[PDB]
Amino acid sequence: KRAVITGLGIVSSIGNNQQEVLASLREGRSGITFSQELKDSGMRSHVWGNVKLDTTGLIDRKVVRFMSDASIYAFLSMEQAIADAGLSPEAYQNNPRVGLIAGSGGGSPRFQVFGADAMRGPRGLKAVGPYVVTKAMASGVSACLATPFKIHGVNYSISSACATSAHCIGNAVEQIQLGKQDIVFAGGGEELCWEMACEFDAMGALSTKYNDTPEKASRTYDAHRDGFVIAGGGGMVVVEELEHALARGAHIYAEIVGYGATSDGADMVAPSGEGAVRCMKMAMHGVDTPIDYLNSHGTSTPVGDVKELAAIREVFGDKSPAISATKAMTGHSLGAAGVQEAIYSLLMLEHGFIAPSINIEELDEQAAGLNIVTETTDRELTTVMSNSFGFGGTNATLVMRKL
Amino acid sequence: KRAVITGLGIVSSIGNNQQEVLASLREGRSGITFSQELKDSGMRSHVWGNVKLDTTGLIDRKVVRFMSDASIYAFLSMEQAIADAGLSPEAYQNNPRVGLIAGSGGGSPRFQVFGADAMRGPRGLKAVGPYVVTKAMASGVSACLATPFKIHGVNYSISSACATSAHCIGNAVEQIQLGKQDIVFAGGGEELCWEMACEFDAMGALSTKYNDTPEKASRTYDAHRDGFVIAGGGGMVVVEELEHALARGAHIYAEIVGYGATSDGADMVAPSGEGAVRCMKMAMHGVDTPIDYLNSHGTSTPVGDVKELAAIREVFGDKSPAISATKAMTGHSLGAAGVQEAIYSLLMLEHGFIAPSINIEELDEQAAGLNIVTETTDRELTTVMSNSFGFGGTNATLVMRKL
Ligand SMILES: C=C/C(C)=C/[C@@]1(C)SC(=O)C(C)=C1O
Ligand SMILES: C=C/C(C)=C/[C@@]1(C)SC(=O)C(C)=C1O
């Protein structure tokens, strides 16, 4: 029935491990840089939320030859989670009660585009090769991790655009609740490339006025925000059944006491708000303790930002929780955003502090009577909430509490 | 607690609705044709499992601007399932207890490539446009249906390659069991294009020796099968809680009495057998009636075919059910294969007959343990099983029974 997080792993724009990520968060350090690749592709947005790591010989050649970047990022995060959970092969491999639910928002537009380019070349099929399917397939993140880690339980991905890894964790929780699994590795990954980024720029979703000052581009709630800053990376958490965890002396960050998954059924590319309201309310249902901190989806987009503020306010009313949008620091890793931000929230719960909402030179008047924390402040948190939304009116909310 | 199917919709290579599909099945009619597109693309495989329907104007212009083919196919299938189920707008729209779980195997390689191609032109972003994200993103099938159809419940896709739509239905069942939803539209869609097909051909997965005789290319269990015949299309079923279905007098096809979801944790692109055995057995927990008919995944590939037959052998021993691989007729629609074949199984349960396993000119030596019906056989069926597997060692099994 009860699901808890007993391990985490992360490869992000602000850190290649939970320790480095902790640093950046408490420091309020930006992971955004100028991208030549993006500028070079023809894009208007030239700022990145890139992973600063040379992944070259980190994954075995036979295993890595099937993967794309989203898979690599999630695979490395999974290793970190396996290690950090205290799990050994004999404990998680070839075991029907151990599963994997992880995905990405866009799969691999790079290798999808590589296979097409290679195919139209004079060598066609031979230029494409036998590994494009596993690299480009939408289920790449799950397929590429489940096989090498010899997972025997559930094995699939959930895709809900900018909310995918959040739904992945919520689904893992349901597997434990249904008594189907004891452990489920949940999370996701996302590649960073002009191939996919250009699509978002094409719809005017990305920031384009701060290319000269990359670290100031992502400015959630700032009156002059102009779109989100795309990013790549991965994250993975170990969702485990309470008794099982306690039984093996597992270290427990918190327990997932709430999971909301709703739908807007209104517009694509634009949030309705009511959808998020029901989602958050659903995640708080039964939680007998108040929400101390709220890690908003806050993408730094004109409409989105205030639309979520309007929702939060209607759900909490007078008594609103402390809020901070860590995207102003990290950027929007799309499909990886959900798990990565759940991890930042878990780190804040574990280290008693609230990461700051940076770059707010001018608070939006639409973000009036709320509590946007712009200073790294030490606080004994107990219950935290994380929101994730994506195109198509898909919403997810996770509420985590200490034991 | 209990989940039943109260409506279905389908757009496939053998039919544009349940009536045409029924006729083709009973007749063992091939939906395979020669593809100039694939031939012109430089592929060794020139046979198609195409949808014979010009979809132009079949969807509101403002609504279809966000969709790719997989989304269109699923959207049309859902239009059918809604009407079939006898659901009125007021019954399923703007309702938190009504959800949508549908996806595809590859999303939209065509629009991932179009975005990249347009980007590298003299028009760049202007040529790309603002609708490529929703078309190219992995969650397209779910995002593009949930919004127009006014869905307020769950909204996301499950992606497990050639098993995705099967896992989608299984997940919908869990939502009903967890008491979270009363109705969940489950299924998926898949586009047909050289962009995605060349990648499979590039790994030698597609049939290439029967281009001169398209209808004989897909030959599951035939000693001379040489890969699967790619296809496109959609399918959607209405998964509904039992008391709910009966309360409104919905017409129930069958109840989902079993859902297995396992993982191989062995090889990519190649099945282990073990895993599919646990998946079937898992689907069988609680089911005490015999399996009267088994709609195998049977892709018409050398290894796959006999690896699944070995697993079926292992699960049933001396008591093996009647088997038939409808892919020899329809082709492999990848992500849509699961829901489409669940529908064929539902149609056979409904009209009392077993669709034939066509093109078996020889029958692999390993298939000696017969009961693979190669002739349309009228028979009163009660419990049927459908298998779905995909790259990455992901397995799904659904068992449906008459009420
Ligand atoms: C239905 C549309 C939604 C939820 C849109 C949001 C707020 S979610 C997101 O990640 C970005 C960039 C947005 O603009
Ligand atoms: C792990 C690999 C698996 C399950 C491979 C299968 C049998 S699934 C499928 O649709 C095809 C074409 C195959 O070859």
Task: Delimit the domains of chain B by residue range.
Answer: 5-258, 259-403
Beta-carbon contacts of residue A21 (< 8 Å; ≥ 6 apart): A10, A12, A14, A15, A343, A344, A347
Chain B CB contacts of A106 under 8 Å are: 107, 112, 136-138
Q: Which residue of B has its CA nearest to A130?
A: B203
- Please tell me which residue in A46, A144, A162, A198 is annotated as part of the active site: A162
Whether ligand 2 lies within 6 angstroms of the CB of B306 is answered as: no
What does the block give as tokens for B288? 């005490």
- The one-letter code for the residue type at B98 is V
Cα separation, A51 vs A73, in Å, equals: 9
Give the burial string for A91-111 (b: 16+ CB within 10 Å, else e).
Answer: ebbebbbbbbbbbbbbbbbbb
What is the C-alpha separation between A28 and B315, in angstroms, rounded?
Answer: 57
> What's the rounded Cα separation, in Å, for the pair B193 and B380?
39
Could you give the angle at the alpha carbon of A29 between the alpha carbons of A28 and A34, nearest 5°? 140
DSSP string, B128-145: H-SSHHHHHSTTHHHHHH
CB B325 within 8 A of CB B306: no
Resolution (A): 2.3
CA-to-CA distance for B107 and B159, rounded, in angstroms?
9
Beta bridge partners of B372: B323
Q: How far is Cα A208 from Cα A227, in angstroms, rounded to an integer?
A: 8
Are A132 and B199 contacting, i.e. CB atoms less than 8 angstroms apart?
Answer: yes
What lies within 8 Å, CB to CB, of B169 at 6+ separation is B101, B186, B187, B237, B239, B256, B259, B338, B339, B342, B398
Distances in whole angstroms, Cα of residue B355 to Cα of each of A298, B220, B235, B363: 52, 14, 18, 17
DSSP A180: S
Dist. CA A161 → ligand 1 center (Å): 9
Phi-psi region of B348 (alpha: psi -120 to 50; beta: other; left: phi over 0): alpha
Which amino acid does the sequence have at B109?
A: P
Phi and psi at residue B69, in whole multiples of 5°?
-55, -40
Residue nearest to atom 7 of ligand 2 (CA): B304
Angstroms from B335 CA to nearest CA on chain A: 10
3-state secondary structure B171-230: HHHHHHHCCCCCEEEEEEEECCCHHHHHHHHCCCCECCCCCCCHHHCCCCCCCCCCCECE
**DSSP string for residues in B63-130:** HHTT--HHHHHHHHHHHHHHHHHT--HHHHTTBTTEEEEEE-SS--HHHHHHHHHHHTSTTTHHHH-S
DSSP-derived secondary structure for A320-367: PPEEE-THHHH-B-GGGHHHHHHHHHHHHHHHTEE------SSB-GGG
φ/ψ of residue A57, rounded to 5: -100, 30
Using DSSP's 3-state secondary structure scheme, residue A232 falls into: coil
Pocket test for ligand 2, best of B162, B167, B200, B340 (most atoms within 8 A of CB): B162
Q: What angle do CA B146, B152, B158 make, to 5 degrees?
A: 50
**How far is CA A243 from each of CA A179, A250, A259, A300, rounded to the nearest angstrom?**
12, 10, 20, 40
Amino acid at A200: F
Amino acid in the structure at residue B281: K
User: Distance (Å, rounded) from C-alpha A373 to C-alpha A348?
Assistant: 13
Q: Looking at ligand 1, which atom is closest to the CA of residue A272?
A: 1
- Chain A environment of B200 (Cβ under 8 Å): 133
What span, in angstroms and rounded, lies between the C-alpha atoms of A243 and B373?
48
Cβ contact A107–B107 (<8 Å): yes
Nearest-5° Cα angle at A55, A49 to A60: 145
Are A161 and A218 in contact, with CB atoms under 8 Å apart?
no
Query: Which structure tokens are listed for B59?
Result: 């969807």
CA dist A362 and A219 (Å) reads: 10
Active site residue B224: no
**Residue among B174, B54, B202 nearest A136 (CA):** B202
- List the helix and strand counts (H, then E) for chain B: 16, 14
Crossing angle of helices B194-201 and B109-119, in 10° steps, is 110
CA distance B7 to B120: 45
The two three-digit tokens of residue B181, written as one number: 């939803």
Residue numbers followed by a gap, chain B, C–N over 2.5 Å: none
Per-residue CA distances from A312 to A105, A321, B132, B157, B218 (Å): 25, 9, 30, 26, 54
Superfamily of domain B5-258: Thiolase/Chalcone synthase (3.40.47.10)
Active-site annotation holds for A332: yes
Q: Give CA–CA dist B268/B264, Å, rounded.
A: 9
Sign of CA dihedral B173, B177, B179, B180: negative
- A228 DSSP 8-state letter: B
Q: For residue B390, report the distance from its CA to the centre of ligand 2, in Å.
A: 5
Segment 293-332 of chain A within 8 Å of chain B by CB: none
SS3 assignment, position B395? strand
Q: Which of A49, A100, A40 minimizes the C-alpha distance to A227?
A: A49
Asked if B178 is an interface residue toward chain A (Cβ–Cβ < 8 A), one would say yes
Residue of A nearest to B161 (CA): A139
Burial B9-32 (b: 16+ CB within 10 A, else e): bbbbbbbbbbeebbebbbebbbbb
Secondary structure of residue B242 in the 3-state scheme: helix
Contact B394 A194 (CB under 8 A): no
Bridge partner residues of B11 (DSSP): B234
Dist. CA B123–CA A362, nearest whole Å: 36
Q: Is A132 on the interface with B (CB under 8 A)?
A: yes
Residue B131 near chain A (CB below 8 Å): yes
CB A239 within 8 A of CB A176: yes
CATH number of the structural domain B259-403: 3.40.47.10
Query: Of B46, B144, B162, B244, which is the active-site residue?
Result: B162
Active site annotation includes A224 = no
* Distance, CA of B281 to CA of A61 (rounded, Å): 35
| A255, B142 Cβ separation under 8 angstroms | no
Distance CA B265, CA A99 (A): 10
Provide the Cα torsion A159, A165, A168, A169; round to 10°. -170
Residue in B154, B194, B278 closest to A96 by CB = B278
**Residue found by looking up tokens 């966000």 in the block:** B66
For the CA of A147, the nearest atom of ligand 2: 1
Q: What is the distance between the alpha carbons of residues A291 and A399, in angstroms, rounded to a whole number?
A: 8
DSSP letters for A62-111: HHHTT--HHHHHHHHHHHHHHHHHT--HHHHTT-TTEEEEEE-SS--HHH
Measure the CA–CA gap between A60 and A239, rounded to whole angstroms: 26
Identify from B142, B159, B397 which residue to disrupt to test chain A contact, counting A C-beta atoms within 10 A and taking the largest count.
B159
φ/ψ of A156, rounded to 5, equals -170, 170
Closest ligand 2 atom to Cα of B161: 10
- Residues having CB closer than 6 A to ligand 1 are A 162, 205, 228, 264, 269-271, 299, 301, 304, 332, 389-391, 393
What SS3 state is found at A319? coil
In sequence order, which residues have a C-beta less than 8 Å from that of residue A166 and are 6 or more positions away?
A: A160, A337, A338, A339, A342, A386, A388, A396, A397, A398
What value, to the nearest 5°, has the Cα angle with vertex A293 and ends A292 and A295? 160
* B245, containing H or E segment: helix B242-248
- B140: chain A residues, CB-CB within 8 Å: 392
Residue B304 Cβ inside 6 Å of ligand 2? The answer reads yes
B116 token code pair: 């990249």
Closest CA to A140 of A191, A86, A89: A191
A130 to chain B: which residues are within 8 Å by CB? Answer: 202-204
Q: Which amino acid, B401?
A: R
Residue B61: how many other CB atoms lie within 10 Å: 7
For this PDB entry, the determination method is X-ray
* CA dist., res. B166 & res. B159, Å (int): 10
Q: Name every residue whose Cβ is closer than 8 Å to that of residue B43 and which is 6 or more positions away in sequence.
A: A124, A125, B194, B197, B198, B201, B206
Phi-psi label, residue B317: left if phi above 0, alpha if psi -120 to 50, beta otherwise:
left
Residue contact A392–B120, C-beta within 8 A: no
Q: Which helix (H) or strand (E) covers residue B304, if one does?
A: helix B302-316
A45: which DSSP letter? -
> What are the backbone angles phi and psi of residue A5, rounded to the nearest 5°?
-100, 115
Q: What's the CA dihedral at A143, A146, A151, A152 to 10 degrees?
A: 0
Are B293 and B384 in contact, with CB atoms under 8 Å apart? Answer: yes
Query: Would you say the C-alpha torsion B155, B159, B160, B164 has a positive or negative sign?
Result: positive
Q: How far is CA B124 from CA A109, A306, B16, B112, B248, in A?
A: 17, 31, 38, 14, 53
Q: How far is CA A67 from the centre of its chain?
A: 19
C-alpha B135 chain-centroid distance: 20
Mark yes or no for CB contact B394/A142 under 8 Å.
Answer: yes
Question: What span, in angstroms and rounded, lies between the C-alpha atoms of A211 and B280?
Answer: 55
Total residues found in chain B within this entry:
403
- State how far the Cα of A45 lies from the Cα of A210, in Å rounded to an integer: 8
Q: Which two tokens stand for residue B69?
A: 């083919």
| Separation of CA A207 from chain center | 19
Contacts of A210 (CB under 8 A, 6+ apart): A47, A216, A217, A219, A226
Task: Compute the distance between CA of residue A1 and CA of residue A282 in angstroms, rounded to an integer.
Answer: 17
Per the listing, tokens 């019954």 go with B91
Q: A387 — alpha (psi -120 to 50), left (phi > 0) or beta? A: beta
Q: Does B388 touch chain A (CB under 8 A)?
A: no
Shortest CA gap B200–chain A (Å): 7
Nearest to A66 among B107, B167, B268 (CB): B268
DSSP conformation class of B336? G
Show the CA angle centred on residue A46, arms to residues A45 and A47, nearest 5°.
Answer: 100
